[PDB]
C-alpha cells in the first residue's frame, strides 16, 4: 500500500482524526485487517496520536 512516513487522509468515521490527515508509520504485509500504521500530531480525547487502519480507511493525501 502506501509508503512509510507518507501522508494520508483518514476516512474512518468513528476515528478521532476522521476527515483529517495522518502520517503512515508503516503498513503490515501480513493478513491483518488493518495494516496501515499512521501517526498523528494532535492527540485524541484519549491522548493517543497513532492508530491502526485498513487500506480503505485512509487515502494518500
Amino acid at each position: 500500500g502506501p509508503k512509510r512516513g507518507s501522508l494520508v487522509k483518514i476516512l474512518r468515521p468513528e476515528s478521532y482524526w476522521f476527515n483529517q490527515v495522518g502520517k503512515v508509520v508503516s503498513v503490515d504485509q501480513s493478513g491483518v485487517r488493518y495494516p496501515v500504521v499512521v501517526r498523528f500530531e494532535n492527540q485524541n480525547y484519549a491522548g493517543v496520536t497513532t492508530n491502526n487502519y485498513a487500506l480503505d480507511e485512509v487515502v494518500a493525501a
Binding site: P13, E14, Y45, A46
Partner: protein, 73 residues
Amino acid sequence: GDFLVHHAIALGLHTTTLILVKGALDARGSKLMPDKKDFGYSFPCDGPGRGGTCDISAYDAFYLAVFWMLNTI
C-alpha cells in the same frame, strides 16, 4: 427602558432556543459519542471516562433549558 427589556426578552428567547436545538439535534450522536442513539433519549451518563461525561443526554439538555425558560418568563 421598554426598548431595553424587549431586547432582554429577545436575548432570553435566543438562549433557550439555542440550548434546546443543540440538545435535540445532537441526539443522534456526537463527536464524543457518535452512537448517542444507542442509549435512548434518557441515559444517566457515560460516566467519568474520556475526561468525564456529565449531563450528556438531550434529556439532560432540555433539563437545563428549563431554567433559562423560567428566567425569561
